[PDB]
Structure formats: structure tokens, C-alpha cells
Amino acid sequence: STGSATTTPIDSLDDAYITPVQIGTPAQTLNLDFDTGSSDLWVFSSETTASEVDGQTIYTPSKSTTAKLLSGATWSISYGDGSSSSGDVYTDTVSVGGLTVTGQAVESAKKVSSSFTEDSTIDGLLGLAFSTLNTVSPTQQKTFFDNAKASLDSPVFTADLGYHAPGTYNFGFIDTTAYTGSITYTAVSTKQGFWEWTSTGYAVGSGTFKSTSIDGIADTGTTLLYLPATVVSAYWAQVSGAKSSSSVGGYVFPCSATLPSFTFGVGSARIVIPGDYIDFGPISTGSSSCFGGIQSSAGIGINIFGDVALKAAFVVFNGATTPTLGFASK
Missing domain, CATH: 2.40.70.10 (Acid Proteases)
Structure with a gap:
């Protein structure tokens, strides 16, 4: 079926x-x-x-x-x-x-x-x-x-x-018509009950790719992308006027900004999140401060590849005896 x-x-x-x-x-x-x-x-x-x-x-x-x-x-x-x-x-x-x-x-x-x-x-x-x-x-x-x-x-x-x-x-x-190129599969740990996997790194905008292991979960029930503070700081440093606001509860940026893309690695493959996906609009109605879609995972205790990341991909949750995750561009 x-x-x-x-x-x-x-x-x-x-x-x-x-x-x-x-x-x-x-x-x-x-x-x-x-x-x-x-x-x-x-x-x-x-x-x-x-x-x-x-x-x-x-x-x-x-x-x-x-x-x-x-x-x-x-x-x-x-x-x-x-x-x-x-x-x-x-x-x-x-x-x-x-x-x-x-x-x-x-x-x-x-x-x-x-x-x-x-x-x-x-x-x-x-x-x-x-x-x-x-x-x-x-x-x-x-x-x-x-x-x-x-x-x-x-x-x-x-x-x-x-x-x-x-x-x-x-x-x-x-559905082989729903994505472009090939699906790259990557190992899953079920030890915490999640679809937990390790990204191979990231890039900010047209910047060079940083190879680094980022353990996180593929979580369709989380809105944003939550990554280590180092990664998130590197992203928002490329947006003029962006800052972390403890009063708002994360990174905000001028609504007048054009956001850079964010790339994450899946093995040797690359998934590109367009900058527009990272804009979550004014913090309050009429505000010129906008809320960012990439936020720090510090104090969550886990990195979360939420909807911001997953919607940039076609994602396979393989529930075979040894589960795996697959990502394709689309």
C-alpha cells in the first residue's frame, strides 16, 4: 500500500x-x-x-x-x-x-x-x-x-x-518526479528516538563551504533552523544591522535587508536554503525589525533541522531495519 x-x-x-x-x-x-x-x-x-x-x-x-x-x-x-x-x-x-x-x-x-x-x-x-x-x-x-x-x-x-x-x-x-538530481542518503542514530543525523558542514551566501560535523534532528514539527551559536553568528554577521535580541528571543534583522542563502551539507551533497526562506517577518505588527529563521540551538541541547531547512529539500525518512535519511534538491 x-x-x-x-x-x-x-x-x-x-x-x-x-x-x-x-x-x-x-x-x-x-x-x-x-x-x-x-x-x-x-x-x-x-x-x-x-x-x-x-x-x-x-x-x-x-x-x-x-x-x-x-x-x-x-x-x-x-x-x-x-x-x-x-x-x-x-x-x-x-x-x-x-x-x-x-x-x-x-x-x-x-x-x-x-x-x-x-x-x-x-x-x-x-x-x-x-x-x-x-x-x-x-x-x-x-x-x-x-x-x-x-x-x-x-x-x-x-x-x-x-x-x-x-x-x-x-x-x-x-516520487521520482518530485526532486532534481539524486537523493543523498546519510546515517541515522535512533538512540534518542529522533531522526538524528550529522550534516557535513555549511556555507553562508556565496561564501566557501566549511567542513564540520553538525549533529541534529530532522524535525518537521519545528518551524526554524536551530544550529550552534558559532554557525548562526557567522550567518547573521553577513546581514547589516542584524543582532541577537534577548528581549525578542533571538536574532532580528532590519526588514530592509536582503538575506543571504544558507547551505548545509549532506555527505558530499549540498542543500541551499534561499535567503527569502529565512525571513519570518516583523517581530510585531508594523515593526521594521524582522525575525530570523536561523537561530541558536544553545540551551536547547540539540541542533534542529526544522521546516526552514527541510522545505528546501525533498526528504526521505527511510524506516528500514537500519534507518537512514535522504536529501535531494528540488
């Missing part, structure tokens, strides 16, 4: 991407944030504290003939941005882009933090990191991809995120 679903930016800045997901019988379609940096599929639901729901579409398991309470199971998750959610668990039929899993753990939120409430466009998350990170207790549950894997034509999914445009998540096949 295979699946193919369009993923759509939630706003004009590409702050996140939503993908329609069918849950239950008859189908209930929720728009979920596909997140290769976590491993829980959770949804706004009929169980969610009413004051914490503001415009989201909810899953109502009592209206699904295939929903079953997973008795005794609970979940609770905290994300890198400090947001969180928790609740109990149903199993139900879940389909993405034509690909159907029966008996998928659907984690129903009883509580969500303010960040989730305040974002009316995201109805939940669908985690695509390794199932070892799944938070369901006392019986850990598998991700959608792990449940689908054995039925897939090939044990892979691909992320093809758009810049200010829709893109695609495919399951079970590699």
Missing part, C-alpha cells in the same frame, strides 16, 4: 503545516501537524476541557463505531517550545492520503496548553519519530508509520514541504 496527502502552511509565514487525517467510522477529518520530532498522535476531542478549545475541530469517539477505549491508558507530553497536552487513549481507524491503519492509538486530549488553544488551525499532532518516544502509559503505543510499515510497498515516508505553498507527505514510495 501507499498514501499521499497534501500538507498546507497554517499562515503566511509557514509557521507550521497541517495535513488532513481521517479518524473513525464514519470518517472525522482533523487537520494534524505531522511531527517527525515526536511520536504521539493526539487530537482535540469531545473530552478536551471546554475553555481550552477555541475553533479547533474535535474528535468525538462516541460517534465512531470503530472507536474503543484503551482501558487504563493515559498520555502526557511536553514539547521543546514549552507547550504540552495530556489525556486518555482510544484505538480507531486512521487514514492518511488513502493509507489506512486499523487499531491506531488516538490520544484524546483532556488538557492542552495555551499555545495549542490559541492556534485554531491545528487540531492535533501526528508523530513520526520513533515509537520509543511515545508517551502512552502503562502500554507504550506505536506511531502511525510504525503501524503501517509492514503493509507499505517500501518502509519509507517522504516530506516535501513548500515555501509559502502547499507540499506533500507520501507513505510507502519515493
Whole structure:
């Protein structure tokens, strides 16, 4: 089997991407944030504290003939941005882009933090990191991809995120029309539960390439590119007037600037992020200070190849026995 679903930016800045997901019988379609940096599929639901729901579409398991309470199971998750959610668990039929899993753990939120409430466009998350990170207790549950894997034509999914445009998540096949040149594959460590890999270096604009190993994670659920402070300083030094602002919470730059590109290495191959991808607009409405899309990972504890980086590439998440990551230009 295979699946193919369009993923759509939630706003004009590409702050996140939503993908329609069918849950239950008859189908209930929720728009979920596909997140290769976590491993829980959770949804706004009929169980969610009413004051914490503001415009989201909810899953109502009592209206699904295939929903079953997973008795005794609970979940609770905290994300890198400090947001969180928790609740109990149903199993139900879940389909993405034509690909159907029966008996998928659907984690129903009883509580969500303010960040989730305040974002009316995201109805939940669908985690695509390794199932070892799944938070369901006392019986850990598998991700959608792990449940689908054995039925897939090939044990892979691909992320093809758009810049200010829709893109695609495919399951079970590699669309050879969706990228240019060849795909370069690189080793993955699953020791932390992430799609963790090592970039071979970087360049700023038309500058020379710096060969240096940068360990990080391929994370579709993170907006920006978070790299070591050395790398990030080198980038923003090429933008006149750019500075790190502790009051804003990262690098800002004059909105009048033209941003240079940023290149990252994948083995001997090179992925170029155009400068426009690194512009996240005014820090507040009407401001002439703009927020940068490349930020320091110092104090996160991990480097994150988030959407800013991933949307410049066609990315293969290879879930074979020995997992690997593939990157192509497009």
C-alpha cells in the first residue's frame, strides 16, 4: 500500500503545516501537524476541557463505531517550545492520503496548553519519530508509520514541504518526479528516538563551504533552523544591522535587508536554503525589525533541522531495519 496527502502552511509565514487525517467510522477529518520530532498522535476531542478549545475541530469517539477505549491508558507530553497536552487513549481507524491503519492509538486530549488553544488551525499532532518516544502509559503505543510499515510497498515516508505553498507527505514510495538530481542518503542514530543525523558542514551566501560535523534532528514539527551559536553568528554577521535580541528571543534583522542563502551539507551533497526562506517577518505588527529563521540551538541541547531547512529539500525518512535519511534538491 501507499498514501499521499497534501500538507498546507497554517499562515503566511509557514509557521507550521497541517495535513488532513481521517479518524473513525464514519470518517472525522482533523487537520494534524505531522511531527517527525515526536511520536504521539493526539487530537482535540469531545473530552478536551471546554475553555481550552477555541475553533479547533474535535474528535468525538462516541460517534465512531470503530472507536474503543484503551482501558487504563493515559498520555502526557511536553514539547521543546514549552507547550504540552495530556489525556486518555482510544484505538480507531486512521487514514492518511488513502493509507489506512486499523487499531491506531488516538490520544484524546483532556488538557492542552495555551499555545495549542490559541492556534485554531491545528487540531492535533501526528508523530513520526520513533515509537520509543511515545508517551502512552502503562502500554507504550506505536506511531502511525510504525503501524503501517509492514503493509507499505517500501518502509519509507517522504516530506516535501513548500515555501509559502502547499507540499506533500507520501507513505510507502519515493516520487521520482518530485526532486532534481539524486537523493543523498546519510546515517541515522535512533538512540534518542529522533531522526538524528550529522550534516557535513555549511556555507553562508556565496561564501566557501566549511567542513564540520553538525549533529541534529530532522524535525518537521519545528518551524526554524536551530544550529550552534558559532554557525548562526557567522550567518547573521553577513546581514547589516542584524543582532541577537534577548528581549525578542533571538536574532532580528532590519526588514530592509536582503538575506543571504544558507547551505548545509549532506555527505558530499549540498542543500541551499534561499535567503527569502529565512525571513519570518516583523517581530510585531508594523515593526521594521524582522525575525530570523536561523537561530541558536544553545540551551536547547540539540541542533534542529526544522521546516526552514527541510522545505528546501525533498526528504526521505527511510524506516528500514537500519534507518537512514535522504536529501535531494528540488
